[PDB]
């Protein structure tokens, strides 16, 4: 609403923020928590974990 | 994923799906024989997101480019020596024979194939 | 359990030998082969003590015999005028020519039926 060219499409965050994101679903659903899965959170190898 | 390889990526994906659907399980050693050097990957059950692959390729390329570099340069230097280059020359001459009013290696469909119509098209493409 | 379906036959084969009357033999049934490991049956009273000593006793040389020999054989083959021997043998041993035969099954003895011969030939291919 401040640009009108489109809604945010990326997040950059601390590891802790990511640990949460990486370990929960994003899907609209009942609930879900586990170990990080799809998101590669190891900064040793990447900087890019995945897409929420 | 660089766009220059888009259709090739799709071809590989299709081949992978067939492998995934097969019974080639109970493998104590990866079923490779020669050529390419392997690498043990994260294997998140089966997953390797492209971004995981990106580091994976760096970590495959570093420990050994030097070896390749030394061997190739060595071979090229050997190739510039007296009576070495000649070995290659004679090998090349016989391996690739090409003369006046003569053919080149060409497709020879002398065994059963789907159809002569296709055989002719295959030959033209081979050319 | 990756080869459990194979093991099923192997277990049977072993049992068929246990149920066989090839007994009262002082000699080993060893012609040319594998490293020998020996334990009692005795309701499995101590196969594990023997196994651990055997395993670590084998670890001691670390299969250096096999290891050194294969590496040696390769290092030998890697030499000039050595590969030639190997390659000539292989060449003479395995022969390919234009549209010719390669190793092939030849069922020239009595067989149960021609159909089986065909099955075997297809499997050979």
Rounded distance, CA A49 to CA A21, Å?
10
Technique behind this structure? cryo-EM
**Residue partners of B124: CB distance under 8 A and separation at least 6:** none
Q: What are phi and psi for residue C115, nearest 5 degrees? A: -60, -40
Query: Other CB atoms closer than 10 Å to residue A49's CB: what's the count?
Result: 22
Taking CB atoms and an 8 Å cutoff, what residues of chain B touch C3?
26
Rounded distance, CA A49 to CA A37, Å?
10
Q: Do C80 and C70 meet the contact criterion of CB atoms below 8 Å apart?
A: no
For chains B and A, tell me whether 3 or more CB atom pairs sit within 8 A of each other: yes
Rounded distance, CA C34 to CA C57, Å?
15
Resolution in A: 4.5
Closest C-alpha among C70, C5, C63 to residue C35: C63
Q: Given the structure tokens 């080869």, which residue do they identify? A: C3
8 Å CB contact of B51 and A49: yes
Rounded distance, CA B41 to CA B56, Å?
7
Residues 96-125 of B with CB under 8 A from A: none
Question: What is residue C35's DSSP assignment?
Answer: P
How many Å lie between the alpha carbon of B109 and the closest alpha carbon of chain C? Answer: 13
Establish if B108 touches chain C: CB-CB under 8 angstroms.
no
Establish if A18 touches chain B: CB-CB under 8 angstroms.
no
Establish if C80 touches chain B: CB-CB under 8 angstroms.
no
How many Å lie between the alpha carbon of C5 and the closest alpha carbon of chain B? Answer: 11
Sort C62 into a burial class: Cβ within 10 Å, 0-12 / 13-18 / 19+. Answer: exposed
Task: Write down which chains contact chain B via at least 3 CB pairs under 8 A.
Answer: A, C
């Amino acid at each position: 609403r401040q640009t009108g060219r489109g809604e945010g499409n990326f997040i950059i965050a601390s590891r802790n923020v990511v640990n949460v994101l990486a370990s929960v679903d994003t899907g609209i659903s009942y609930a879900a928590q586990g170990l990080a899965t799809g998101f590669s959170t190891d900064t040793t190898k990447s900087v890019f974990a995945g897409v929420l | 994923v660089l766009s220059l390889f888009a259709p090739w990526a799709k071809m590989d994906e299709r081949n992978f799906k067939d492998q995934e659907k097969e019974d080639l399980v109970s493998i104590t050693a990866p079923k490779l024989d020669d050529g390419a050097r392997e690498f043990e990957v994260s294997s998140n059950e089966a997953a390797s997101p492209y971004n995981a692959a990106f580091q994976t390729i760096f970590g495959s390329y570093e420990p050994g480019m030097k070896t390749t570099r030394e061997l190739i340069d060595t071979y090229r230097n050997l190739m510039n020596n007296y009576e070495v280059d000649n070995a290659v020359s004679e090998i090349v001459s016989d391996a690739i024979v090409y003369e006046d009013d003569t053919e080149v290696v060409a497709l020879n469909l002398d065994k059963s194939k789907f159809s002569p119509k296709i055989k002719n098209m295959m030959l033209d493409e081979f050319s």
